[PDB]
Amino acid sequence: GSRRYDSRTTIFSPEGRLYQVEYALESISHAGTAIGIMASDGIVLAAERKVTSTLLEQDTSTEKLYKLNDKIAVAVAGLTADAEILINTARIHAQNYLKTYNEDIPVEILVRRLSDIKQGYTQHGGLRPFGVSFIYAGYDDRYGYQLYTSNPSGNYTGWKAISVGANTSAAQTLLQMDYKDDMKVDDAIELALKTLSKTTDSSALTYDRLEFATIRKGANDGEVYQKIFKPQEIKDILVKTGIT
Amino acid sequence: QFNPYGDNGGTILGIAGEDFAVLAGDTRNITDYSINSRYEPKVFDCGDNIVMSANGFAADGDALVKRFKNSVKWYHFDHNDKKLSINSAARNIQHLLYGKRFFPYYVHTII
Amino acid sequence: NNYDGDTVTFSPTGRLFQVEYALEAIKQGSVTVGLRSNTHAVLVALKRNADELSSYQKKIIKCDEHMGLSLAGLAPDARVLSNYLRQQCNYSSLVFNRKLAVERAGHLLCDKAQKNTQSYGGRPYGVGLLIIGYDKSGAHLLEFQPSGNVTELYGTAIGARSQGAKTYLERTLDTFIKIDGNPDELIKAGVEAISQSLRDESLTVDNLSIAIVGKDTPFTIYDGEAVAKYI
Amino acid sequence: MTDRYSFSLTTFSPSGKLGQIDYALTAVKQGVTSLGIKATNGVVIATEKKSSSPLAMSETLSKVSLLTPDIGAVYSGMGPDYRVLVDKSRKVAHTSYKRIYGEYPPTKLLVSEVAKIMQEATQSGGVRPFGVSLLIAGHDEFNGFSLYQVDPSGSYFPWKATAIGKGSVAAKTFLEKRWNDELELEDAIHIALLTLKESVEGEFNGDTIELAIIGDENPDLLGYTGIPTDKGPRFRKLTSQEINDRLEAL
Amino acid sequence: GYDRALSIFSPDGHIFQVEYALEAVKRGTCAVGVKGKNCVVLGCERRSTLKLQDTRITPSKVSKIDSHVVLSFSGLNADSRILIEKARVEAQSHRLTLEDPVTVEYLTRYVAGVQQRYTQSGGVRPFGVSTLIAGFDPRDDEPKLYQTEPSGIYSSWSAQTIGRNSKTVREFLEKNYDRKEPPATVEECVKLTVRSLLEVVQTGAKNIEITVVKPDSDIVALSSEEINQYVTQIEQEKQE
Amino acid sequence: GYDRHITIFSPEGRLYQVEYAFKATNQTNINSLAVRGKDCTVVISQKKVPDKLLDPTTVSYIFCISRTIGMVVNGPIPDARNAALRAKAEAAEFRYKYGYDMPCDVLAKRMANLSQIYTQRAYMRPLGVILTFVSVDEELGPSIYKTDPAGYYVGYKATATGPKQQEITTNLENHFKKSKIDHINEESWEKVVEFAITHMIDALGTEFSKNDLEVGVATKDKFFTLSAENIEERLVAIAEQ
Amino acid sequence: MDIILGIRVQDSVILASSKAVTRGISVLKDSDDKTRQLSPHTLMSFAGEAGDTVQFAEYIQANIQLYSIREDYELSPQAVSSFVRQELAKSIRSRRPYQVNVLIGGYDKKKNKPELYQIDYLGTKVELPYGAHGYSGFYTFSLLDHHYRPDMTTEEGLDLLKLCVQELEKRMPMDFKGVIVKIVDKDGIRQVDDF
Amino acid sequence: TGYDLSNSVFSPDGRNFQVEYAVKAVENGTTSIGIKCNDGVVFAVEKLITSKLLVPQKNVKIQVVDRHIGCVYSGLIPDGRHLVNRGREEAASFKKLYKTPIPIPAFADRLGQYVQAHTLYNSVRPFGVSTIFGGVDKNGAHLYMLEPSGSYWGYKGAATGKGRQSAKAELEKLVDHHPEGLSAREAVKQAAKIIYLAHEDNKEKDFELEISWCSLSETNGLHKFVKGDLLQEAIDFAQKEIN
Amino acid sequence: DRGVSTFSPEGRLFQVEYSLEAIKLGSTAIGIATKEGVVLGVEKRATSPLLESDSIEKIVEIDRHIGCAMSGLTADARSMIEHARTAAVTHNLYYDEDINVESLTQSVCDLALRFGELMSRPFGVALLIAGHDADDGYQLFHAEPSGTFYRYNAKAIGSGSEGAQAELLNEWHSSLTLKEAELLVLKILKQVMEEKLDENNAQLSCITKQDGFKIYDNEKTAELIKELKEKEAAE
């Protein structure tokens, strides 16, 4: 019968590793680097686009940064198409919670569920896992600002600052070296860009090869605002930190 | 409207002695004011020394007896030809009847 | 070799190795003999214990009052097939008030065994059966193989070393076919036939199993002290 | 019987590639060139109508397809995969949008829906990926004119201008040289025809070239009159004759 | 649906997928449980290749199933969430139908059954997780500690460890735990637990977690300093 | 090398099972041809009855799908009949649902989509056949539409299929290069059938008796096959020319 | 069932709920507690169809207790009341709908405010200073309209409740066998044992 | 390669080897034939008598479908039974909806499509039988033969199994020597001979002959078995012609 | 691979034969049937001194008249026990009587071959089912994952079984008393066990018509262990 053509996506190696998870992680390591940094007064998301062309429409684009609800966003590393499947799930999950409890969903709860879905694909159903790692940036009135990452295994962990995708080893060392706890948002913005600048595989860092976002309470009083940066705004913040 | 039940009349009677028991019933079968049959027996030997009658609506009575005799058959098949005791027969019949709790067999059963 | 992974694969010469391997389990099974006259049909079965501390695996199953079988090979498969047979016999009685023809019983088993040989994931039945019965056209003996092939016979045997019994019955044919209206003489010829298949062991009292069905005889099994008469 | 293939046929190799997506892209690579260019007041999508035989009637084979009145598609790769995608794309524009909101989906969202269908063929049990890349050009009130590319993986990107298939590498270089953000629709059509002549080997005329635009509303193509707010489809397929007119002035 | 038998016997009578699940447990961070006279203590190693971790929000290694029972584990983290969720749902279901919270043994038997089920079901792999489950039965002061593993077998332990280098720390507990005298206080019990982790961990910095469970739903996590004091104290008496 | 056993891509983006289904298309070693008149569409196919024990009348690769649609098949008969039965069911359902007769080109597309599905879905094998659909459509006029195991389809001025297809194709191409038009400029279908058989003979370089051929004709509102006697009458007319 | 009242005062929510359980012409029980603690600072009283009331209450209770464990956090009264409303709203279009009316009295620890929610079997939710289900309201709403103030102390709330129960004992046709009273404030839930 | 291990896989020639392997199982079986005649059809089959223990006349191989159709087959017997059970279901449902008994060409395709269906997937095995069948309907007599591939045609005469070539040659003679038509009683005789002539290729074992027929005049259009004096008459005619 | 339900060329089911290999790796379990009762005994075999030995539960009650000992992948037995208990209690509900030991055993054995591509693999555990009924008296059954069950006068299963069974062949006769059988199980367990037999690392039980099925306390067994040491030094 058909058994002959079955890869068996959900089995252990003799070392006790999930082959497909491992290989998906290998896949993700060639994806454009994404960085999240959490400050006392906000969160930065910054990501590098896969080697853009000059004729690509840059302003009406979305490859790396996505909005889940008004309080939560994600940075993506891996297959975009896979990520959008999971994003719409997460969006629906957020709305079910709001409808049920008349309260915005706590950041972790959304992250846990999305991670649980990924986990399922590694244990049953014989399908390939999603080739995606997320950085979740969000706010709720229990833990305030939070960063999380989840990967194809369905494992998630919380962070002060973290990178996913390409060159995470180099990227993490540089963040570990300059990160401080009292740090403000605008310093994190600088750290984020200065890190990508050093870890990119490109000749130099330019506005057109970047997506950028912040989550601050720097709107008006006890209420949170998400800012997905326009291309001009990224060009400005790049000059403002003298990287160009 | 279709009425799935009817009343076939008749009456039955069981008495227990010290080392015997009798189960009797008339052989008349009726609907309304008509006789269907003057001899249609409704007391049956079911094997294992059990006799049974299910009086009331004949079609349900026959269905039940048929099912019970069949129960005796399979009791042998499944339990090394063991004899079905009268108390065990009784309990088995309870489950046959109550299995149709929401669409009952219209019968008074005696064994 | 390359073509024995499952029942759904033909070999290049047109063989079904999984069915043939199923046939092989029958050959390892303990011998059982079937034969009939025009008034009775008889099964004799050599039972097999595990050691000196164990029971002797029963080989004969009653299907209805007028029908039953003996088994060689996987016992659980015989349980499934005999159960199916009991249901078909029963269905025939309850619905039609008609005892199931031994011939129809055979057709029904063939078709049930066949389904397991043409689809993915299943396996063939690993058991052979000898069905005896007395119906509206007299005494009958059938041989069931899990290939699906069912054959009507005067006499036969299946299992390990059944070949001895099979040649004896082939020689004894014109004698036993006419043991009409004598129960114990048909059983004697069955016991004589099954003896042609014994090696380094003789028929004991908890070793031998006999069944008889016929004109004025419900299918019934003899065991233990009730077979001592025949050793 | 039935599908016993409930497991994925596309899986990660140890190096992290997804083989079947890669190979689907290779099939797109062999496909005949097609392209799209975005002007300020329109979009143009074009492709070669390379024929199977001169006995075949290539009018009956449409490589450029209307999806909604303001959205059109063209492709490179395996035609029959494209054909069923157009069928599904048309239906999904109704079932998951028009039947809900009473209007047609905006370009980006319909593209998103097509991409989803293609992604699912990259992960679902017992299927291979689609062997095509699509270029989808459209207009909607709030986003204006747009042009998207959808790949076998389900990925999509917006473009000012691009090409796919056989001679894409040359064509993309050509388009970079001639594109600007002030192109008027007629200019883009002329650039499209120029780019396509490089990749076309044999005859180059109105019968060997298929070409459509997303531009102005066409009330003459509506079918009826009397509702001011309905002004007609923005999608229009240029006639064999219309293409030839622009080939003299090439 | 997907049917494949992934857990099957090999010719030597081994189910490799179950055994490969144990390999994943082996790679997991160490976990240990020790029961006192009057308490159970669950300690867990935390690998220090991860700094810049946010420990307010990062998943804790010990989890409450109910207010009186806790579960820790070694192996795949994502797998463990599935078992914890089921156990928590079962805990509430038990209270609802029996009008009594679960016994630790019952809750263990349940989690073990789920794991077992996944070793002979089509289309699924076994859980790459072994658990330590501990607490106190309702209205009972005797402490309980159980261990489950991917095969589905479960059992009671005076003290036990799982995960990487758990053989080294089982060695330690085997020489350092007297059956005739269990650690008579909370203080004593937590000490023996931290001591055993220090055979394997490193500096006991952000590297050791301790959770202390006492009768009548009395459960608390120790903070860095509280643990640090045990770390600092153990080392001074050590230089001998 | 299991990428050659099921319909998944090979490293160079090919589908081998689809390609091997095309090779099964020629297994019967029969050639077919279709042409359009003014009023009609004619399809002719070789008829070879090797065994003397066969009933010649039951050997056919032309099917009447609907009252108006005819279909000729190049490939093994079991797959051909499978394709025929489905198309009949599809054309009948279409009429029931939409209140008008299924057009040739639409039926062709539907069968093409069904075929595509077997090229993408793994548990389904492609049918080893090529389907040439013919009619006189009420909107489009005389029509030829052809489907293959890849799910490809297109309309034709005329076409041929089989082992010697290329000879027949170039023969027909050459005629239309000359004739300057899309069709056989002929009044009666009888003469279009005569044209068809004539160019079949030139292209193949063989002569035909009445039992070597099989002919189907589509006219306004009906499709019909010719009998051996109708073909004999047609062959006689060709001889006397 | 029958009588369930609630009053939110300055710092707490008080729930009074009748003690009788009557079936036919027999009062089977005169000490029935028609309430369940959903979380340490949230209490739900209930009245309606026999069997349905408790089954529903306990089902909600289990769900909230499950949430509490999973998230190691107490859900706000608003969120619990919304969860409860959604369950009832599902039920009304069920094959057999739960016929249960509830009052949810909670203390929100983030806001430091008491909150009272009245929800009927249809899933009609309203936040109120005081609430009643059934015929109770026909007497108590007018009485409370008059004597209620938003800044009342827990003690004043209890005296206002005595006045309600007295009016119900005067004019209600049936003997509801007095009420069990519970207070929900910043320190949790406690029962007054002499009313 | 490995193309022959899975059913429904095209080889690079364009063949499905599993169906070809099924044909080998057919070629391995006993011989069976069909002869179309003036107003009917005749079926016969060779039944190898393996041993004296087989009850003669009692292992019937020919099967009736509905009241008017006979089927006989060579190869895996249970596969043939399965196919006939399906044939019976198909004829029952045709009669249920359309009232008229199923026409023979119509019936042929029901089996054809069903068998062809067993070459479409790797999860089933092809049928290991060639089936000769036919009968009489409102358009006269029809004889059909159907292979594991699902391929079938109409026949003047047909044969399959170990002795197919022998029988075929013998059948081709009859077709040449009787262009005007063979009669029912005639064909019964001829069938007996051909089975005897084709038994040379299976001659270790001796056999039992079995014949059936549908003729519009001789059996009223219904399938009946040939027994008693008429069978012995045809057995004898065959005994003549081998000697 | 190859189908989970495949036959070998010798006509045996691969998966069934392989489960038999896992049962051989199991801890030893022994049962002996007598006219005064059936005795079941097991080697507990704790993997470390820290594991509390009374939590090892390889002897199990099915009904008051039926008990069970296991050997092999013991986690696989939980659902077999659960089925057994449900079958027995259900039988009593339908028939107002005790369920026959053989019928019980048959019901359990029906589960066993219900595997393939129903559960994903055979069971990796063998059971000694022991009980009493009024029709056939005291009985001992050995239920394998092949779906086959044999009645035994005495039987050993597990790693020590081939040695133990030869030992049981000599010692068993038709007139053993209950006390004799208890000592005999203890004796043979001590022989085949790796570790030294005592009241903590082995366990006893029996089923009598009068008192039903009972597991023995560690105190009670300790005294039978002392008693056995005394009988054997004394010749």
Swiss-Prot record, chain B:
Subcellular location: Cytoplasm; Nucleus
Entry superkingdom: Eukaryota
Function: Non-catalytic component of the proteasome which degrades poly-ubiquitinated proteins in the cytoplasm and in the nucleus. It is essential for the regulated turnover of proteins and for the removal of misfolded proteins. The proteasome is a multicatalytic proteinase complex that is characterized by its ability to cleave peptides with Arg, Phe, Tyr, Leu, and Glu adjacent to the leaving group at neutral or slightly basic pH. It has an ATP-dependent proteolytic activity.
Family of the protein in this entry: Belongs to the peptidase T1B family.
Assembly: The 26S proteasome consists of a 20S proteasome core and two 19S regulatory subunits. The 20S proteasome core is composed of 28 subunits that are arranged in four stacked rings, resulting in a barrel-shaped structure. The two end rings are each formed by seven alpha subunits, and the two central rings are each formed by seven beta subunits. The catalytic chamber with the active sites is on the inside of the barrel.
Protein name per its UniProtKB record: Proteasome subunit beta type-6
Source organism per UniProt: Saccharomyces cerevisiae (strain ATCC 204508 / S288c)
The gene coding this protein: PRE7
Swiss-Prot record, chain D:
Disulfide bonds: none
Keyword Nucleus: yes
Cross-link Glycyl lysine isopeptide (Lys-Gly) (interchain with G-Cter in ubiquitin), where in sequence: 108
SMART domains to which the protein is assigned, alphabetical: Proteasome_A_N
One GO cellular component, as annotated: proteasome storage granule
PROSITE patterns from the UniProt entry: PROTEASOME_ALPHA_1 (PS00388), PROTEASOME_ALPHA_2 (PS51475)
Entry keyword Cytoplasm: yes
One Gene Ontology term from the biological process aspect of the record: proteasome-mediated ubiquitin-dependent protein catabolic process
SUPFAM superfamilies: N-terminal nucleophile aminohydrolases (Ntn hydrolases) (SSF56235)
Subcellular location field: Cytoplasm; Nucleus
Keywords linked to the UniProt accession: Cytoplasm, Isopeptide bond, Nucleus, Proteasome, Ubl conjugation
Chief location bin: cytoplasm
InterPro entries the record matches: Ntn_hydrolases_N, Proteasome_alpha, Proteasome_alpha-type, Proteasome_asu_N, Proteasome_sua/b
Functional note: The proteasome degrades poly-ubiquitinated proteins in the cytoplasm and in the nucleus. It is essential for the regulated turnover of proteins and for the removal of misfolded proteins. The proteasome is a multicatalytic proteinase complex that is characterized by its ability to cleave peptides with Arg, Phe, Tyr, Leu, and Glu adjacent to the leaving group at neutral or slightly basic pH. It has an ATP-dependent proteolytic activity.
PANTHER family: PROTEASOME SUBUNIT ALPHA/BETA
Family indicated by similarity: Belongs to the peptidase T1A family.
Note: Present with 7060 molecules/cell in log phase SD medium.
Protein name: Proteasome subunit alpha type-2
Native source organism of the sequence: Saccharomyces cerevisiae (strain ATCC 204508 / S288c) (Baker's yeast)
Upper classification of the organism: Eukaryota, Fungi, Dikarya, Ascomycota, Saccharomycotina
From Swiss-Prot, chain F:
Domain of life: Eukaryota
Cross-link Glycyl lysine isopeptide (Lys-Gly) (interchain with G-Cter in ubiquitin) per UniProt, renumbered positions: 222
Subcellular location: Cytoplasm; Nucleus
Gene name of this polypeptide: SCL1
Disulfide bonds: none
Family label: Belongs to the peptidase T1A family.
Subunit annotation: The 26S proteasome consists of a 20S proteasome core and two 19S regulatory subunits. The 20S proteasome core is composed of 28 subunits that are arranged in four stacked rings, resulting in a barrel-shaped structure. The two end rings are each formed by seven alpha subunits, and the two central rings are each formed by seven beta subunits. The catalytic chamber with the active sites is on the inside of the barrel. Interacts with CIC1.
Protein name per its UniProtKB record: Proteasome subunit alpha type-1
Keyword Transmembrane recorded: no
Keywords from the named record: Acetylation, Cytoplasm, Isopeptide bond, Nucleus, Phosphoprotein, Proteasome, Ubl conjugation
Entry keyword DNA damage: no
Classification via SUPFAM superfamilies: N-terminal nucleophile aminohydrolases (Ntn hydrolases)
Cellular component per GO, a single term: proteasome core complex, alpha-subunit complex
Known function: The proteasome degrades poly-ubiquitinated proteins in the cytoplasm and in the nucleus. It is essential for the regulated turnover of proteins and for the removal of misfolded proteins. The proteasome is a multicatalytic proteinase complex that is characterized by its ability to cleave peptides with Arg, Phe, Tyr, Leu, and Glu adjacent to the leaving group at neutral or slightly basic pH. It has an ATP-dependent proteolytic activity.
Pfam families noted in UniProt: Proteasome, Proteasome_A_N
Modification Phosphoserine occurs at: 227
Predominant cellular place of this UniProt entry's protein: cytoplasm
From Swiss-Prot, chain H:
Its biological purpose: The proteasome degrades poly-ubiquitinated proteins in the cytoplasm and in the nucleus. It is essential for the regulated turnover of proteins and for the removal of misfolded proteins. The proteasome is a multicatalytic proteinase complex that is characterized by its ability to cleave peptides with Arg, Phe, Tyr, Leu, and Glu adjacent to the leaving group at neutral or slightly basic pH. It has an ATP-dependent proteolytic activity.
UniProt keyword list: Acetylation, Cytoplasm, Nucleus, Proteasome
A Gene Ontology biological process term: proteasomal ubiquitin-independent protein catabolic process
One Gene Ontology cellular component: proteasome storage granule
Boundaries of the shown chain within the full protein: 6 to 248 of 288
Gene (name only): PRE10
Further remark: Present with 12000 molecules/cell in log phase SD medium.
PTMs per UniProt: The alpha and beta forms are probably products of the same gene with different post-translational modifications.
Any one GO molecular function term: mRNA binding
Compartment(s) of residence: Cytoplasm; Nucleus
The name this protein goes by in its record: Probable proteasome subunit alpha type-7
Family: Belongs to the peptidase T1A family.
Organism field: Saccharomyces cerevisiae (strain ATCC 204508 / S288c) (Baker's yeast)
